[PDB]
Amino acid sequence: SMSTYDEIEIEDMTFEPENQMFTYPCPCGDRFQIYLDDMFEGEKVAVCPSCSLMIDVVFDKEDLAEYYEEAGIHPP
Amino acid sequence: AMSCVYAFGSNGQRQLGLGHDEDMDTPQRSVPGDDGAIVRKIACGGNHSVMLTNDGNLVGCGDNRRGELDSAQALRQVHDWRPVEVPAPVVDVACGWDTTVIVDADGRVWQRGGGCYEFTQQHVPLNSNDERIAVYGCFQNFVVVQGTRVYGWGSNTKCQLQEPKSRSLKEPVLVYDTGSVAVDYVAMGKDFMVIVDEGGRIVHASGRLPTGFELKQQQKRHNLVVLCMWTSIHLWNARLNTVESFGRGTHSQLFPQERLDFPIVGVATGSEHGILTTANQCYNVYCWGWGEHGNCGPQKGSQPGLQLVGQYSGKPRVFGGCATTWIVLGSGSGSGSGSMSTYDEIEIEDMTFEPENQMFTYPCPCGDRFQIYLDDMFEGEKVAVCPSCSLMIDVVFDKEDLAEYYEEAGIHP
Amino acid sequence: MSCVYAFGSNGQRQLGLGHDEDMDTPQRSVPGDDGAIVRKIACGGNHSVMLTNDGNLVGCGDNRRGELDSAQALRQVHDWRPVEVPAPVVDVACGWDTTVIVDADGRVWQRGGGCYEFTQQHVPLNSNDERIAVYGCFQNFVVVQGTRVYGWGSNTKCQLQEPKSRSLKEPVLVYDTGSVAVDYVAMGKDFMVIVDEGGRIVHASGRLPTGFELKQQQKRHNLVVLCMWTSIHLWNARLNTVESFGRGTHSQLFPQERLDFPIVGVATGSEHGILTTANQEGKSHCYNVYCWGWGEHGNCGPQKGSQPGLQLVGQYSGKPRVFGGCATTWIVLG
Amino acid sequence: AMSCVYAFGSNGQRQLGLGHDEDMDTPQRSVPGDDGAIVRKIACGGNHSVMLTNDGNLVGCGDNRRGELDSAQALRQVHDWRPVEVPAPVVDVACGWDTTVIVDADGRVWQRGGGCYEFTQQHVPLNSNDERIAVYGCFQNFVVVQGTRVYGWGSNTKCQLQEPKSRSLKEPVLVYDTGSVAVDYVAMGKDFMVIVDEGGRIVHASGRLPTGFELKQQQKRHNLVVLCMWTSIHLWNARLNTVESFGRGTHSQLFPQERLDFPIVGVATGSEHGILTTANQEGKSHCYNVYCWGWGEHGNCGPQKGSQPGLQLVGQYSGKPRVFGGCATTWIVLGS
Amino acid sequence: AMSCVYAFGSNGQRQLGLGHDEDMDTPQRSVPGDIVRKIACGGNHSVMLTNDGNLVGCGDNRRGELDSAQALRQVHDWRPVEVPAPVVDVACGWDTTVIVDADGRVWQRGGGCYEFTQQHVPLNSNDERIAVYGCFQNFVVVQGTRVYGWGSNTKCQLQEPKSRSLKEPVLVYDTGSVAVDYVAMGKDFMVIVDEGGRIVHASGRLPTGFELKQQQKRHNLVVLCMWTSIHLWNARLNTVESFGRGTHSQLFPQERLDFPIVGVATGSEHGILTTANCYNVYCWGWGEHGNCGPQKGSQPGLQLVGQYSGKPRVFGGCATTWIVLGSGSGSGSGSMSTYDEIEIEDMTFEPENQMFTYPCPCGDRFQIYLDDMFEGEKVAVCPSCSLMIDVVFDKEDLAEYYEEAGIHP
Amino acid sequence: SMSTYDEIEIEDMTFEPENQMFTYPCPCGDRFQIYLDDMFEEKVAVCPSCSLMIDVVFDKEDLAEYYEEAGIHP
Ligand SMILES: [Fe+3]
């Protein structure tokens, strides 16, 4: 398993409907990122592209249906 | 006579004011404009840095993709130190992840960034007197403190402002009211808050407090200095000359519990790193915690202990940001060596009163005279300024001490 | 199961990620099994090989020299495809364009380097409980059984025997102790270092890098020897540090400062080092993985400037197995 | 024989004798009437400068709105170097904020300025001996030293003369008597005072002494040289080849504690800046380096006016220079 | 692949490339916009040469030292310098800039001319590399054995006798046997050193205490030069012998050094010492602009200005100090030089396209063309990384491969 | 009594026609400067932004060349 920097609730994550990606501020200035599709498969670890930090996304499968709907409503 | 600003650490969006976007591990001289500026206070966000000059002007640099700095929506990044447009001279300033909140001399709270590209006024119920208005902010929350009352707004997902949970609070609410002692400052972390009065006592705490922190146990203490990282609380204990840290220490954020050989004279924290200032055999500056971007020094391994990042003649003022470290020399504020602060304290009886123009004068080392008006002192002004240089002096007097000179001058007070 | 992560030079898709883009952060590399427990990962110049506990071998990367698949038409293995073996594999190593395996029957097979078929390397060995280990780097390979150390391949720097030779197709006796059993053989480009089970350097051959005085090093005990292409790295467990010897043009030389974190594992690629330490701050004891040396392909992390010092690439709950490669870094965790 | 006077710093009232009123960051030639006479001493006020030569002549330049220089009230400011009219040849001289005090060859003490445009004799109870009569002054206090006795007059708001507090003492009073070892000199600051004997020991201190300076402990030391800025005390320790400062040091008035590889041969201080004379012994020709430290935003410490800590080289000279300091003004006197 | 360039000292014209114009006393990372081989400094301008042959400069431009536009009085931050051809070597004067292209022709700008004026110098057309050196108001071009130079001549540093300047280059000195390694130049003097470490010829106003006839008899010496002083690096005695007035500590501390000297560089009136330890860099001499460190009193002794893991390359300018890690030089640690020395017998020859290949740690191969090697090139380059290796071979070793390929040389 | 950095011939100096002032390059990057009137009276040039000094070597003559180029004096 990974050693996470923090545990973040899915309602605290910044959802981006353009690409179905959840983002969260990283202490280095960048953002932890994790895709909706990966979360639907069972993955819960967000990853920062700039540093070595990682965080856990706390969610359930019954929480993901909301964000899939928001992704389809989002304009072209 | 400017301030020597040193900056190093994360520099992805040129938020170090160096012109380039290279991460630094050793203190680089950050010079705003050509000649520089007298920096009083530095506030840092996720990818942007804001400096408050001693004359109420803001100068910033870094990311502008959220409207943190410039109002031009087309401008994505402010490369070098550029003046931040303000509606009025700034008294205090704080920053969020992508936001900038200021407080003017008129007593109005303005906020920019986070999508908005214009300073939108925050309407907080405040009084109109000598009680100054200070602003503190971190991550997605800001706090305005006036004397006793503590107001705040922003995120409320961990009940760091009120109950129950809320995704955000646009309109400011009453976070806490002491009802007695004046609130000194508010140490803010990520989704948690700690309130400290002038007695050094923790009066109130809210939000998702880091593990190990027993609030009811800590409130029984006093003479404490509370520092905060995003996920940790750090209690400066001057009496035992140590720093007590709380929460997980996955990246050495927890202060080294080893006995220090020198007295602590100052403690500052960034996002996930701490800055320690101690005396010497003159002044040493150490960094600990997560620092794989150079904010802790050349060793970016986040190993435990304290990295000596610099040694200074006078006591420096340190500021912590998101993986960035700021060291300021000659802030113009304080009372230590090489601080460029107040020159001397003079009793009003030593001052030279001039009834011809209602003014008190006192000899200046340059050859001129510090000057101060009588009516201004009736309003509470206790500072005489030289007309040809930085120096200034504090005039010690009481309100009833002015009644003598009003009579000598022949003016009704 | 075993989760395999990889990053670095990916020009020939040797990371098993499917794409040819160089990475600077640990990427989830997934074969067609994953549920099985990884034993060892061996890397060549542009091809990677993963040995599992079930004896199955799987590889990916360049096949223009027959490194992986027998099909001469196939120039590159796209994803993690099973490497055809005559028998279950016990141990495996790789050369610049070669792959050598050691099966359960005790036979040593070699493919690649022009040969698209597994050709049995006839090395004189015994038939008992003494395990047969294989080691390899660049253009050389070494088979170790008990006390004997055999080897073949190149010999331009007299790494096998004397005098110089362009190649030695048939396995010759490199060295015999002949008392203490040989633990392993750390191999560089054109040199060789033999270590016993006592942590002592028993013998060294080939073009040894500058600064390394063999006579002075044989008087030392309890050492762990790692080898890059042009440098030797000594892991002194007692002093908790890594002693390095080489030109160090791109920061290959370990930062000779005493580490606070206890070193629990050391691995080396072609020109970069991989350090695993213990992080015992906080309630949970975790493990930090650092990288140093030439890593402009991102094999040392996001910082590709090849600056001196350790670079943190990740924290993990359990102690991971790290493996080196040609500008590639592998992290394996359960 | 000839003295070459160099001056720079605050020049708001043309007290640099340069003829103009521009602040200088580099040494400038200050040529008086007799630029061939040997300079004995240079005393500086707040805005007026006074130069004394061996021939007993006094010349001055700078402000005169308080009567520091000339008896003519309509002379607001003395443009260039002008002969200061004296009742007798001057042997020693000292300046206050807006006052000038002299000691003549007859042994009398005269004071002008601070309102009075006339040289008024200060009647200090002296003895009819051959003992030299020295005068020292700063801000609003003057001191006359003869033998072992130290007399003084002026301000007394901080009890720098006697007890208790007085707004002013017009008549000279006995500040201190040793009364064995002869007093070498008296280092004066703003509303405070330090007395030193010929043994290099601090015999007595009075007035608002700056923080960190504990008189009781400093009296147990020998072979010292005491300098005084307005709000700081400085101790030249030749044994350790360094200067020990005592003050808040808001503008780098505190001498750099680092090791000096050059031997110190002379130390002087202005209002809020120090002047260091060192011996450059590197090479065949031994020359002298002059450094400045402390508050120098008027260019009185050199080209760099940021008042940054550390010594700032302002010039190098063949022979040993004699340095003098005033209110943000630096004087360098030579000889050729 | 990136060189870390540190810079501090006089910054009155932004020649440090830091953006601001404040003088620095501590090494600041100078970053060219968003691999450096050599740094040349002038009076108030700086020139930085890269491995790919490009020049990037910053500083004063009131004499045309950098940009051709006359309206540009000063170059803010690092900006590219327009060159007619890839530069191999670059030197600087008080207000000038002289370059040497791969074509083997010398250009000069600055000092009044806002355009690169070609300096016609009688040179050959072979493997002999063309090096250039310059200081104050004089420049010297050395292709090997022969030494040409132009500029001022008020102190007879070019010929005899006088006067002012010489626009047309003249033959300063010819050995004519042993090749000239370098030419150390001062303000109004000049010292020529061969590859034997022997002073061959010296012209101009030599500083006091320096007798030429006494020094010519010596060998294995490294000659460095300030404006008014000559400094000899005696590696055998591990010290630096200085010759001059030394009014501001220019004379190297003749005290016993604890660690072996590994590098000596000089500015206008200050020296930069590099010793072992991992690597310490010291600065002595006149440095009241912070160019010698925080202590700007020009006191005698060595000021520690920093410590480095790998052996750094150093350059000195007019009251400025440059420290570059991971340059494009040779040998040393952390210098990012040539990766490894490989014999031609260990190379892989490809007769199809006349090319020699050798494995690279990145996974690719170092390549080098046969035709290039016949002209005297010995460095193989990897398509995909900073790497470079040196191929050891002789001219008579190429005949075997020309026969295998079937091509006449 | 000026301890100088170097002695420079008046012919080697640089003359700015309008200012009646000779300049010479300085190791700090600036330039030493001396006035012609002071030379008829001083042989020392001073750098504005440093602390070095140089001597301008000349006799009690050979200054008419620059006097005539100035268009005025003596
Ligand atoms: Fe990050």
Ligand SMILES: [Fe+3]
């Ligand atoms: Fe003033």
Ligand SMILES: [Fe+3]
């Ligand atoms: Fe490569």
Ligand SMILES: [Fe+3]
């Ligand atoms: Fe200069």
